[PDB]
Amino acid sequence: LTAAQELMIQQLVAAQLQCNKRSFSDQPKVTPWPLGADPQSRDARQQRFAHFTELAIISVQEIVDFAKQVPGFLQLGREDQIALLKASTIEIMLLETARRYNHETECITFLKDFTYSKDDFHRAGLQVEFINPIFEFSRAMRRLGLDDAEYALLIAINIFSADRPNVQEPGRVEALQQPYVEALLSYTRIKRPQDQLRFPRMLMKLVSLRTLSSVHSEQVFALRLQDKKLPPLLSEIWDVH
Amino acid sequence: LTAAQELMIQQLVAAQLQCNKRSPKVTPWPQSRDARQQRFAHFTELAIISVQEIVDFAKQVPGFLQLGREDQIALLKASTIEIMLLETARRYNHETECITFLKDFTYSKDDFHRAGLQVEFINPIFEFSRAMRRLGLDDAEYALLIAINIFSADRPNVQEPGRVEALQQPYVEALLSYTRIKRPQDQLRFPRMLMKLVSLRTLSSVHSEQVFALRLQDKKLPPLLSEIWDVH
Ligand SMILES: O=C(O)Cc1cccc(OCCCN(Cc2cccc(C(F)(F)F)c2Cl)CC(c2ccccc2)c2ccccc2)c1
Ligand SMILES: O=C(O)Cc1cccc(OCCCN(Cc2cccc(C(F)(F)F)c2Cl)CC(c2ccccc2)c2ccccc2)c1
Numbered sequence: 001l002t003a004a005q006e007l008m009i010q011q012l013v014a015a016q017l018q019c020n021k022r023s024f025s026d027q028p029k030v031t032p033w034p035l036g037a038d039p040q041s042r043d044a045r046q047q048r049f050a051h052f053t054e055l056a057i058i059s060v061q062e063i064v065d066f067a068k069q070v071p072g073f074l075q076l077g078r079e080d081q082i083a084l085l086k087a088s089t090i091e092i093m094l095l096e097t098a099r100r101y102n103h104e105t106e107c108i109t110f111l112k113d114f115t116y117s118k119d120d121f122h123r124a125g126l127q128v129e130f131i132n133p134i135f136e137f138s139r140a141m142r143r144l145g146l147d148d149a150e151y152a153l154l155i156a157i158n159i160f161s162a163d164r165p166n167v168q169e170p171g172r173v174e175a176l177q178q179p180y181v182e183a184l185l186s187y188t189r190i191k192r193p194q195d196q197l198r199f200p201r202m203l204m205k206l207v208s209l210r211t212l213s214s215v216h217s218e219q220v221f222a223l224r225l226q227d228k229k230l231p232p233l234l235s236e237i238w239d240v241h
Numbered sequence: 242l243t244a245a246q247e248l249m250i251q252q253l254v255a256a257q258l259q260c261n262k263r264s265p266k267v268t269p270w271p272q273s274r275d276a277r278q279q280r281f282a283h284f285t286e287l288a289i290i291s292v293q294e295i296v297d298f299a300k301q302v303p304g305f306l307q308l309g310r311e312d313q314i315a316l317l318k319a320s321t322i323e324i325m326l327l328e329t330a331r332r333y334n335h336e337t338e339c340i341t342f343l344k345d346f347t348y349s350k351d352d353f354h355r356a357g358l359q360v361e362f363i364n365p366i367f368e369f370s371r372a373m374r375r376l377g378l379d380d381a382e383y384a385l386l387i388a389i390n391i392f393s394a395d396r397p398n399v400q401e402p403g404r405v406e407a408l409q410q411p412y413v414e415a416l417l418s419y420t421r422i423k424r425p426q427d428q429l430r431f432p433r434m435l436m437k438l439v440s441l442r443t444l445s446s447v448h449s450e451q452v453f454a455l456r457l458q459d460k461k462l463p464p465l466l467s468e469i470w471d472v473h
Contacts, residue, residue, distance in 0.1 A: 136395075163368075163440045181432050200413050203435045208395050210442035 005183040012152035015069035019062040027111040048124035072176040087164040091209040101138035130219040153184040253384035256301040260294045280356030304408035319396035323441040330373035362451040385416040
């Protein structure tokens with residue numbers, strides 16, 4: 001690896017780590033999960049869903065801040081930064097969620113200590129069409145066994161996707177993406193020099209994330225039909241309105 | 242390149258050319274409402290022709306008939322629109338900004354609008370087409386991309402995803418080696434190609450939205466397309 005590729009990876013990893021520290025700091029601010037008689041009532045379902053929207057709000061805000069720290073992001077015009085973040089945020093959340101899936105327990109751990117089973121998501125009113133694919137994707141991500149440098153680079157590559165809607169300088173976005181693809185290629189070559197299909201398997205995950213983003217749109221659309229509104233920051237990125 | 246890999250690549254290239262060479266009669270291309278439905282009927286029929294090619298090509302991709310019938314159907318259902326977009330990109334002429342079906346039938350961005358397709362559908366297909374032309378894939382690269390697209394284990398309703406992924410592997414290896422030997426000083430060739438598979442997933446959603454917009458606009462897919470793209 002060149003010094004510049006090493007610097008680049010260190011920057012992304014360190015920025016990610018500041019984001020994690022913020023999550024740990026805000027865990028005490030989150031409205032506790034109802035550990036109630038869990039009486040299959042309408043009230044506690046709303047409380048679970050609301051508690052989940054707060055985790056999502058935390059992640060959406062960290063993603064905004066992380067992207068300013070990604071070398072090159074600030075060279076794009078503000079309208080393209082917005083467009084790239086609009087589209088890639090849900091995909092980055094899915095990657096960060098897969099990274100926190102525990103295949104042994106079949107549970108996901110957000111923030112510092114908040115851990116959730118399949119049925120926990122079901123209990124917040126999320127549809128099976130949403131839950132099941134996210135868990136499939138997470139266990140697929142685990143088989144690759146990505147480290148910190150690999151997750152971070154994948155995320156940067158995801159941010160600089162030139163086929164997002166409303167992008168005004170798509171060629172420019174592709175040229176900012178290329179150094180990240182290059183660093184991921186060189187890094188995987190050096191780390192597992194005898195698994196040559198690892199690199200293309202990682203990029204295939206970018207493909208899966210597009211489908212999941214679609215699934216997510218249908219979930220939010222099912223929310224509109226159920227009269228469940230999202231909080232302002234989430235509504236701002238994901239509702240058509 | 243090993244003999245097994247040359248065999249497989251050549252098989253795809255020759256299959257692709259024989260599917261093309263062999264492929265009929267169509268509704269004449271003719272602004273009134275009768276005329277909208279006309280142009281639309283016309284393109285619907287060109288799309289059926291393409292579906293027939295793709296289906297015939299898939300059953301000749303080594304690996305495809307090793308799968309159960311259910312997975313065969315599931316992978317074709319999902320792949321068809323994506324391969325069609327790939328074939329459409331291939332028939333884009335950069336110099337005329339027009340797309341040519343079947344040697345002869347030629348159309349511009351306007352022609353697609355005059356047949357009542359969303360602009361939200363047309364503009365992304367033309368963006369993809371021209372991006373695909375910059376990449377300049379050769380016959381082997383296209384063929385191999387298509388086979389890789391077919392064997393995506395994450396399609397809806399796949400029963401044996403581990404098997405589908407196992408079958409995708411040798412096509413991915415063959416594309417890696419082909420690009421290393423045929424373009425040795427373009428390191429990112431290979432990943433740029435795989436990144437088109439990402440674009441295609443999103444184009445697939447855009448297409449579902451266009452199918453949905455036909456449903457509320459009282460515009461019916463003909464039965465062979467309906468079997469693929471309508472719900473229920
Ligand atoms: O944990 C951290 O440190 C920061 C972080 C990183 C990633 C995710 C995260 O919180 C996610 C909270 C759980 N979640 C909420 C959610 C996300 C996106 C949209 C919606 C909504 F629009 F539907 F409201 C919701 Cl409710 C759900 C989670 C999930 C996991 C497993 C099955 C089903 C759902 C999820 C969904 C989409 C993307 C990522 C996670 C905090
Ligand atoms: O010409 C050949 O040799 C065989 C061939 C190869 C590729 C395409 C093809 O048919 C062209 C049909 C044009 N088309 C119709 C269409 C395709 C897919 C879905 C739908 C529907 F769901 F809307 F019904 C339609 Cl109407 C549209 C075409 C297009 C190009 C550019 C802008 C807008 C639309 C297209 C759309 C999607 C995928 C491929 C082509 C025959």
